[PDB]
Design an enzyme around this catalytic site. Sequence first.
Site, PDB file in Angstrom:
ATOM      1  N   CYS A  94     -21.457  23.795  25.817  1.00 38.10           N
ATOM      2  CA  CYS A  94     -21.272  24.180  27.231  1.00 38.10           C
ATOM      3  C   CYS A  94     -22.004  25.506  27.467  1.00 38.10           C
ATOM      4  O   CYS A  94     -22.039  26.353  26.577  1.00 38.10           O
ATOM      5  CB  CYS A  94     -19.798  24.228  27.617  1.00 38.10           C
ATOM      6  SG  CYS A  94     -19.156  22.579  27.996  1.00 38.10           S
TER       7      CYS A  94
ATOM      8  N   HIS B 138     -14.946  28.195  32.552  1.00 32.61           N
ATOM      9  CA  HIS B 138     -13.899  27.674  31.635  1.00 32.61           C
ATOM     10  C   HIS B 138     -13.958  28.413  30.289  1.00 32.61           C
ATOM     11  O   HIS B 138     -13.014  28.229  29.479  1.00 32.61           O
ATOM     12  CB  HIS B 138     -13.919  26.140  31.544  1.00 32.61           C
ATOM     13  CG  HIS B 138     -15.049  25.564  30.756  1.00 32.61           C
ATOM     14  ND1 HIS B 138     -15.866  24.569  31.257  1.00 32.61           N
ATOM     15  CD2 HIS B 138     -15.498  25.838  29.513  1.00 32.61           C
ATOM     16  CE1 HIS B 138     -16.749  24.235  30.338  1.00 32.61           C
ATOM     17  NE2 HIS B 138     -16.552  25.007  29.265  1.00 32.61           N
TER      18      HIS B 138
ATOM     19  N   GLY C 285     -18.936  23.409  21.990  1.00 32.85           N
ATOM     20  CA  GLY C 285     -19.743  24.633  21.834  1.00 32.85           C
ATOM     21  C   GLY C 285     -21.054  24.574  22.623  1.00 32.85           C
ATOM     22  O   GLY C 285     -21.726  25.642  22.716  1.00 32.85           O
TER      23      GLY C 285
HETATM   24  C1  LIG Z   1     -19.084  21.804  26.363  1.00 38.56           C
HETATM   25  C2  LIG Z   1     -18.099  22.514  25.470  1.00 38.56           C
HETATM   26  O1  LIG Z   1     -18.499  23.401  24.724  1.00 38.56           O
HETATM   27  N1  LIG Z   1     -16.796  22.146  25.537  1.00 38.56           N
HETATM   28  C3  LIG Z   1     -16.251  21.008  26.269  1.00 38.56           C
HETATM   29  C4  LIG Z   1     -15.316  21.515  27.344  1.00 38.56           C
HETATM   30  N2  LIG Z   1     -14.218  22.287  26.753  1.00 38.56           N
HETATM   31  C5  LIG Z   1     -13.305  22.817  27.773  1.00 38.56           C
HETATM   32  C6  LIG Z   1     -13.110  21.912  28.965  1.00 38.56           C
HETATM   33  C7  LIG Z   1     -12.171  20.894  28.952  1.00 38.56           C
HETATM   34  C8  LIG Z   1     -12.010  20.074  30.055  1.00 38.56           C
HETATM   35  C9  LIG Z   1     -12.775  20.260  31.189  1.00 38.56           C
HETATM   36  C10 LIG Z   1     -13.709  21.271  31.192  1.00 38.56           C
HETATM   37 CL1  LIG Z   1     -14.698  21.541  32.599  1.00 38.56          CL
HETATM   38  C11 LIG Z   1     -13.879  22.091  30.100  1.00 38.56           C
HETATM   39  C12 LIG Z   1     -14.735  23.382  25.928  1.00 38.56           C
HETATM   40  C13 LIG Z   1     -15.717  22.893  24.888  1.00 38.56           C
END
Ligand SMILES: *CC(=O)N1CCN(Cc2cccc(Cl)c2)CC1
Lengths: 304, 304
Positions: free
Chosen positions: A145, A41, A143
């Site tokens: 992830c 993602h 951030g």
């Molecule tokens: C963990 C992190 O940095 N973020 C949370 C997720 N986001 C994008 C996202 C939205 C919905 C589903 C998923 Cl799998 C990802 C980015 C920031």
Amino acid sequence: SGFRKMAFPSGKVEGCMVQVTCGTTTLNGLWLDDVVYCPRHVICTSEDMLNPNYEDLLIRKSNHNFLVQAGNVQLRVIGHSMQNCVLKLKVDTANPKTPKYKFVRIQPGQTFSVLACYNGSPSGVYQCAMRPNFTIKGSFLNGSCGSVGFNIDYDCVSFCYMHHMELPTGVHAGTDLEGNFYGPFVDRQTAQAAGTDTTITVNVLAWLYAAVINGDRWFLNRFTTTLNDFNLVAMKYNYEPLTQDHVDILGPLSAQTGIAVLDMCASLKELLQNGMNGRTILGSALLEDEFTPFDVVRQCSGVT
Amino acid sequence: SGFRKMAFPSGKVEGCMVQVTCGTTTLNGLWLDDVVYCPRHVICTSEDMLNPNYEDLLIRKSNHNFLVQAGNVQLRVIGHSMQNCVLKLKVDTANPKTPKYKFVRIQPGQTFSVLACYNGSPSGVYQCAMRPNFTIKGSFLNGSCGSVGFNIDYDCVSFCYMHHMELPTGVHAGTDLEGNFYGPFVDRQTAQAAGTDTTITVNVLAWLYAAVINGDRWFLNRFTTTLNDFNLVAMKYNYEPLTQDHVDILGPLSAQTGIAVLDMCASLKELLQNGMNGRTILGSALLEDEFTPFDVVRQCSGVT
Ligand SMILES: *CC(=O)N1CCN(Cc2cccc(Cl)c2)CC1
Ligand SMILES: *CC(=O)N1CCN(Cc2cccc(Cl)c2)CC1
């Protein structure tokens, strides 16, 4: 003496964390040998996240679109591929700090350490369990992830988790390092509800053994029970069923304390039926289920 | 979202841990520049520990009696001195992994990370508080002495604790890195009882703010109170008195949540008077007091 929720030392994993930027999205990557692993993602605009076609989105991305920074040094990306829900970015430099490592897919009830990172930079380390509903109860801001969960066996890091998402209920979902989600979750901004968060019975028993070893004994009673009788009470209290496999795994703690597993089951049974009556066990007012039998033995025997 | 008991990443401290052996006693040392810091009780036989005269015991020790091992490489000891309750062993090699560092003496209520070590080898990392009775509630087996507590500000490790002893009650006592014990404790095998372990009120409030930020709000009520009224309830429940300084420190969490500090005091007051009635806050059945206001802000804002 003393019993603490204890994480693995994080240094070996700190040495693997990098920043991955694709367009305007920044998250964390795991640099092992000449590969950087990160959530796929990273290629999405939050616009994309409602129903992303990752193969179609990835066609528009070249090696030079993936900006990989280790400290304040850029890595040259020489290849990229999608495996399940992770990207593998081939870089021209092996990570000189690559530890001995394995990728393992853990089972529900297994514990691991999380090194929370932002922009490839470690912020903190805590201990988690894979919940029976394949969520984890983490601490993850935007951030975070690409932050990873791991176990260490002496000098070998077993990576078991990479963080991908928060559910609307504020619990966490992610993948193993082959990019396969734990549980039924998908990397899309859609309705995803967790199942029953049941208590990991074998872990509670391990932690009751830890309590006895460390001097907390008030809850020990005069009773015993059977696996079938105990399991009737476990079902009623949304505890996982206890199997002979769990009993076998508790054998060494049984032996060290001289308390038969089924006696400790009968202690747990009375705690479920009667509550703590305002008392505590190892500084907790609820039954802790994020220590494995292996964890209790390790911390109680001082393995490094 | 999510709020976890989170330790600093331990890598910078892992790089400083060594084994110190004097005769038959092995514990941990902290190698910074060309000095190894360790508990002075490394020179004792458990026979010595009943009433040790450290100056007299140290006269019998030469530089070559202190065996210092970093990994599987021996360091050459070229000097030794006693400062308070620590030994400073001068070695001929600066630790190449020495981080930017400070020695700080923390106040009761301040939190820090502990890197538990055995034979100079990290076993785990957890978060602690200096208790108001100047004990810490750790996880420390024999061989763990010389394990250190620290805070990190970006790239600077502030060392605040070195582990020296367990009290007969299974709580922990130690020194700052100048070798001065926290509290009235001495490095002797004698009757040493901790005072009242009072609850760190300002930390509980911080953690109530953390709970609100992360969606746990059931305990918010319609009431307010005053510092004097609150403090009457705090005294009754062995909570530390709340000062205007504590109120000032909570200002940013007040501001972020729009809940006046004294309103959250009134929430805490009702929780003390009424209990949790079987409910939980951030997965705890008791009021957590080992997060500082700074800790809550950090974890809630994602500082690295
Ligand atoms: C963990 C992190 O940095 N973020 C949370 C997720 N986001 C994008 C996202 C939205 C919905 C589903 C998923 Cl799998 C990802 C980015 C920031
Ligand atoms: C922490 C550790 O490794 N050990 C516990 C302390 N013990 C020696 C000792 C006994 C009594 C008082 C004091 Cl300050 C130290 C050595 C092993």
